[PDB]
Design a binder for this molecule. Structure first.
Ligand SMILES: Nc1ncnc2c1ncn2[C@@H]1O[C@H](COP(=O)(O)OP(=O)(O)CP(=O)(O)O)[C@@H](O)[C@H]1O
Ligand SMILES: [Mg+2]
Ligand SMILES: [Mg+2]
Lengths: 302, 113
């Protein structure tokens, strides 16, 4: 029943003050908290953090899942576009996974409150350039994740956090896997499957690669440009696979250029090898972002 | 009409990136400059408003300069007008920017790196 020690990541439970809930899943819960001295350079200063933990009705397996997700975050390492792991409470008491606080919630919430007029944050209404910036940041985070030879398996707007300075943080590493020196992950158990974000090969063979993450990335792109819309509208999950094999793809969002849509459609290529790598996504999005940024002129006609 | 060529805020030869480099050093709304563009008869006013840097096209045609729906005899008239009248969100033009103004109200450019 007990967890193995790891002194460098361990954090004292008195040093921590649990607070306002941020998210609740079935077996999981995320709460806001104050953790004093979690910065090693500022040993006396309190830091606002987020803490992932289980409900009391969580099973033994629910626990090993949370431990695995934590170890994934240790292995992945730090990047400006991946949510920061701060430390943990593993010893004598409930498992607390301590992580950087993102004050603007998840990308879906963030986008929805920043739509044009009909919660809302009107002064932060999204522009085309912002949308592209979002996408480029997430492309970079994924490019790093893939360079660590890991796969996410759950890219979605519900698992991206937005910080106070509008930085995209890839999060929820509960499906993530190490695929170093094997280059595919083959799921043998059934499970929680984010069906509307999965490549057809993953739906069918239960096998995951950097290529199926790229498929998920395209769905994420769609979520962004529909400003937090829900994929495959009016289509039930039991019908998606057949629909996908026979050629069905989501329509172009209006906020989306033809070029960005074609990028989108390319992530959804039926043949995994014909999809772009995250590296290629980064290069092309860098180009598009710069072009958009350099060509903005304010229009005072209205 | 071409009296703008004398003013402190006018730049006959200055890129968009250079104007950004200058305006980034003056974090005040109302900081601005006018630059000639490469296209004939075009200018841009580059200014700061609500914390961010903006660029606007300004077209000349015959005896008139145009900015959005506003028309003026000259660039000097256009600038003089948007000092006493809001140009974008209650923001009036305030701090004319060139490299000598930046010596005085601008953040210092780091000599080392
Ligand atoms: N560091 C953080 N800062 C702010 N909000 C956070 C946060 N981490 C999580 N949240 C909130 O909780 C939600 C995410 O919870 P999370 O995705 O991490 O696990 P989960 O609820 O999906 C159950 P499982 O992990 O098994 O899939 C986010 O959508 C966000 O609203
Ligand atoms: Mg989530
Ligand atoms: Mg989640």
């Amino acid at each position: 029943f007990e967890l193995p020690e790891d002194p460098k990541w361990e954090f004292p439970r008195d040093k921590l003050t649990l607070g306002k809930p941020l998210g609740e899943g079935a077996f999981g819960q995320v709460v806001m908290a104050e953790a004093v001295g979690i910065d090693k350079d500022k040993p006396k200063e309190a830091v606002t953090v987020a803490v992932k933990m289980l409900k009391d009705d969580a099973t033994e397996k629910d626990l090993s899942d949370l431990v695995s997700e934590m170890e994934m975050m240790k292995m992945i390492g730090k990047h400006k576009n991946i949510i920061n792991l701060l430390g943990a409470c593993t010893q004598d008491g409930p498992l607390y996974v301590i992580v950087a606080y993102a004050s603007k919630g998840n990308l879906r919430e963030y986008l929805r409150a920043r739509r044009p007029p009909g919660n809302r944050v009107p002064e932060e209404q999204m522009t085309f350039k912002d949308l592209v910036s979002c996408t480029y940041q997430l492309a970079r985070g994924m490019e790093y994740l893939a360079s660590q030879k890991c796969i996410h398996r759950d890219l979605a707007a519900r698992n991206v956090l937005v910080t106070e300075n509008n930085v995209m943080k890839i999060a929820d590493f509960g499906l993530a896997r190490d695929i170093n020196n094997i280059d595919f992950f083959k799921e043998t158990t059934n499970g929680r499957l984010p069906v509307k974000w999965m490549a057809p090969e993953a739906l069918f063979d239960r096998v995951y690669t950097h290529q199926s993450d790229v498929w998920s990335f395209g769905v994420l792109m769609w979520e962004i440009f529909t400003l937090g819309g829900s994929p495959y509208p009016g289509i039930p999950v039991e019908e998606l696979f057949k629909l996908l094999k026979e050629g069905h793809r989501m329509d172009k969002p209006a906020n989306c250029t033809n070029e960005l849509y074609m990028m989108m459609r390319d992530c959804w290529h039926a043949v995994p090898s014909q999809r772009p790598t995250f590296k290629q996504l980064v290069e092309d999005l860098d180009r598009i972002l710069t072009l958009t940024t350099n060509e903005e002129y304010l229009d005072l006609s209205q | 009409m071409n009296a703008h060529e004398s003013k402190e805020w006018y730049h006959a030869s200055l890129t968009r990136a250079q104007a950004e480099h200058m305006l980034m050093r003056v974090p005040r709304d109302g900081a601005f400059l006018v630059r000639k563009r490469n296209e004939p008869n075009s200018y841009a006013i580059s200014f700061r408003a609500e914390g961010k840097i903006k660029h606007c096209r300004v077209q000349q045609e015959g005896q008139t300069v145009m900015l959005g729906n506003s028309e003026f005899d000259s660039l000097v008239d256009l600038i003089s007008y948007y000092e006493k009248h809001p140009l974008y969100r209650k923001m009036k033009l305030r701090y004319p920017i060139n490299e000598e103004a930046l010596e005085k109200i601008g953040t210092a450019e780091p000599d080392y790196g």
